[PDB]
Amino acid sequence: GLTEEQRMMIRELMDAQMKTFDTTFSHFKNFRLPGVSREEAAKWSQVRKDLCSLKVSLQLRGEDGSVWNYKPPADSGGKEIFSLLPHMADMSTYMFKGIISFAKVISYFRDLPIEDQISLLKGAAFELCQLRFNTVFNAETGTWECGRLSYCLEDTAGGFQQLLLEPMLKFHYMLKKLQLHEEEYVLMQAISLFSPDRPGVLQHRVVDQLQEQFAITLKSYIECNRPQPAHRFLFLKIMAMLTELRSINAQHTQRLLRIQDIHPFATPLMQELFGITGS
Amino acid sequence: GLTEEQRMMIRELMDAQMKTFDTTFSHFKNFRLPGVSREEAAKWSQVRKDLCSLKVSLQLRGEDGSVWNYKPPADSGGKEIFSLLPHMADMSTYMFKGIISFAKVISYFRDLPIEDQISLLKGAAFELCQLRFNTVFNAETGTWECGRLSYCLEDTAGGFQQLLLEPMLKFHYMLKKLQLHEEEYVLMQAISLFSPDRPGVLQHRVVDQLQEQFAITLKSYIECNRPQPAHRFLFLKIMAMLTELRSINAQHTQRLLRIQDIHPFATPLMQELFGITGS
Numbered sequence: 001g002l003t004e005e006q007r008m009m010i011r012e013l014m015d016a017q018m019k020t021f022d023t024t025f026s027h028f029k030n031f032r033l034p035g036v037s038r039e040e041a042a043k044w045s046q047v048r049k050d051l052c053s054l055k056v057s058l059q060l061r062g063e064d065g066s067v068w069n070y071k072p073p074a075d076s077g078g079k080e081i082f083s084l085l086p087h088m089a090d091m092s093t094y095m096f097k098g099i100i101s102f103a104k105v106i107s108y109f110r111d112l113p114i115e116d117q118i119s120l121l122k123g124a125a126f127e128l129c130q131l132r133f134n135t136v137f138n139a140e141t142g143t144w145e146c147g148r149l150s151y152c153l154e155d156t157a158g159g160f161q162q163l164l165l166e167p168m169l170k171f172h173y174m175l176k177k178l179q180l181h182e183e184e185y186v187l188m189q190a191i192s193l194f195s196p197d198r199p200g201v202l203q204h205r206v207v208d209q210l211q212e213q214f215a216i217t218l219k220s221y222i223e224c225n226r227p228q229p230a231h232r233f234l235f236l237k238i239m240a241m242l243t244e245l246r247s248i249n250a251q252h253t254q255r256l257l258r259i260q261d262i263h264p265f266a267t268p269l270m271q272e273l274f275g276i277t278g279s
Numbered sequence: 280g281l282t283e284e285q286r287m288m289i290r291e292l293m294d295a296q297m298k299t300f301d302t303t304f305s306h307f308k309n310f311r312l313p314g315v316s317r318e319e320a321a322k323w324s325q326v327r328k329d330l331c332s333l334k335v336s337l338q339l340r341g342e343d344g345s346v347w348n349y350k351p352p353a354d355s356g357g358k359e360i361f362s363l364l365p366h367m368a369d370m371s372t373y374m375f376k377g378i379i380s381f382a383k384v385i386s387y388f389r390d391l392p393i394e395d396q397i398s399l400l401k402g403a404a405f406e407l408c409q410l411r412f413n414t415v416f417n418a419e420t421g422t423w424e425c426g427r428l429s430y431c432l433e434d435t436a437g438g439f440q441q442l443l444l445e446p447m448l449k450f451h452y453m454l455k456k457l458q459l460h461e462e463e464y465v466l467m468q469a470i471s472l473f474s475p476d477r478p479g480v481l482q483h484r485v486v487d488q489l490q491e492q493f494a495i496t497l498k499s500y501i502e503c504n505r506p507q508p509a510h511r512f513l514f515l516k517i518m519a520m521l522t523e524l525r526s527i528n529a530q531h532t533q534r535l536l537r538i539q540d541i542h543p544f545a546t547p548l549m550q551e552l553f554g555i556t557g558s
């Protein structure tokens with residue numbers, strides 16, 4: 001069974017999720033939409049490869065029942081590969097705010113020194129974003145269902161299996177297949193958030209002990225509520241997914257910074273979280 | 280055969296069409312797009328009936344290869360029925376300018392007094408718009424193909440036959456089925472433009488004689504270039520379509536003014552041409 005402290009812990013995390021996760025994306029508005037040198041040469045080639053590796057179309061369902069649909073352009077060696085970047089920057093920025101709010105509502109987080117709060121959020125914001133995004137992911141239709149917005153994966157030559165070579169996409173399908181509870185998602189967010197080895201963390205003995213407690217609570221939760229053979233080793237699978245998410249976080253940070261280098265687009269909040277300084 | 284004067288006449292009309300018809304709609308830009316009392320009660324009911332009687336979705340093909348698609352809302356008793364009005368006002372305004380330019384390039388038109396020019400354009404602008412729109416109408420797919428913009432008729436319960444109850448739509452299908460030449464379309468535009476019985480025309484003996492000459496030139500053109508049994512009575516069918524277009528013009532003017540009464544949207548050029556004064 002769960003100890004009282006373990007029940008309190010889950011309770012406070014679920015409370016924080018409830019207050020700060022706009023699951024219908026109702027308050028996401030005023031966002032942008034797509035319009036209607038050998039060293040440099042190597043930079044663009046890489047960014048081009050990075051960008052086309054994850055193509056989505058976009059749908060907007062109006063409250064009135066109207067539907068707008070956007071199919072992205074092909075790469076034709078020009079700036080059209082950047083068409084969805086302002087929009088995506090706005091969406092991630094919106095998600096990041098929710099995630100910052102999530103963190104601030106948690107007592108264990110508030111109690112850390114401010115410099116560590118910042119270091120942990122800089123370290124985990126993206127990961128907590130992916131974790132929240134997975135809960136609105138539809139693995140049957142390859143679509144992230146964000147209230148009135150949908151982001152639908154473009155077909156490719158190898159269909160599912162091939163698009164699934166992309167680590168971000170493999171991560172989303174694999175996590176969704178685990179069929180996690182809300183409680184388990186939010187404990188994943190805590191474990192990722194309270195990671196002792198993020199750049200700049202000072203109170204890392206504290207953070208490490210906090211992390212260990214969230215992990216023990218998760219292991220205990222699974223043991224108390226999931227007896228089926230399907231869920232044998234579920235706790236270890238989740239921890240393995242969390243390690244993988246940190247790898248993905250590192251890869252995508254590098255992509256971001258590679259795009260940013262040749263085509264600036266990061267919002268001010270994005271710059272803050274990813275260490276772009278404005279100069 | 281055609282007399283020299285008849286060849287000159289067609290030549291000058293075709294010249295005017297060539298210079299003033301943006302057939303790829305390349306210069307149509309900066310247009311608006313849909314966003315992302317018992318006496319009054321009777322007004323809205325009528326306007327609602329008027330508006331839903333011709334529903335189109337809209338597609339925009341970007342030069343980069345991107346595609347935007349808009350599916351209109353259902354009537355739910357609110358202002359959503361007006362969603363495409365600003366856009367359509369911008370498109371018609373764009374077409375009207377081309378049509379005004381067309382008229383001004385024609386010697387027979389320039390030679391009329393200015394007050395008659397204005398009276399003829401007020402009378403015929405809409406009709407010449409429909410005539411030009413028919414040349415980019417695709418009767419197989421029920422779409423008006425305006426370069427990178429397409430306007431596609433929405434499906435309904437009776438399919439083609441039922442949507443074809445709408446006089447505007449019946450007119451477009453019937454005219455397209457006649458498979459007219461460019462020359463014949465532009466002579467239709469001249470006959471409509473030079474109509475002696477538009478409100479306010481003063482030199483109507485002149486205009487009537489001008490109109491009669493364009494009609495004789497058209498009859499002669501058909502007789503010289505169309506011997507097939509399919510085209511027997513083609514000249515009379517065209518004149519019957521022109522009479523029908525004037526009926527449509529009267530109906531649609533009333534719809535326009537009915538919408539305008541309860542929901543103003545007409546551009547300044549629209550107001551000028553339809554006699555809305557600004558007060």
Ligand SMILES: C#C[C@]1(O)CC[C@H]2[C@@H]3CCc4cc(O)ccc4[C@H]3CC[C@@]21C
Pocket residue numbers: 047050051052053054085088089092093252255256259270
């Ligand atoms: C390059 C590249 C990509 O693989 C396709 C689009 C890129 C994202 C664009 C938006 C965005 C926003 C962030 O806050 C952080 C990263 C990104 C980019 C990550 C790499 C992506 C998915």
Ligand SMILES: C#C[C@]1(O)CC[C@H]2[C@@H]3CCc4cc(O)ccc4[C@H]3CC[C@@]21C
Pocket residue numbers: 326329330331332333364367368371372531534535538549
């Ligand atoms: C009401 C109604 C309708 O049948 C559907 C949309 C209406 C048009 C909107 C744009 C427009 C522009 C013009 O310059 C003149 C008329 C109109 C309206 C005509 C009636 C329409 C087709």
Ligand SMILES: ClC1=C(Cl)[C@]2(Cl)[C@@H]3[C@@H](Cl)[C@H](Cl)[C@@H](Cl)[C@@H]3[C@@]1(Cl)C2(Cl)Cl
Pocket residue numbers: 054056088089091092129130133144151168252
């Ligand atoms: Cl997830 C995910 C979503 Cl969602 C989109 Cl729209 C975008 C957000 Cl804005 C950032 Cl946070 C992340 Cl890296 C990406 C991806 Cl992989 C896509 Cl391109 Cl699908």
Ligand SMILES: ClC1=C(Cl)[C@]2(Cl)[C@@H]3[C@@H](Cl)[C@H](Cl)[C@@H](Cl)[C@@H]3[C@@]1(Cl)C2(Cl)Cl
Pocket residue numbers: 333335367368370371408409412423430447531
């Ligand atoms: Cl034709 C024709 C076209 Cl085109 C559209 Cl988009 C619109 C123009 Cl802007 C005005 Cl001029 C005319 Cl009345 C209408 C219709 Cl019937 C539709 Cl709603 Cl299809």
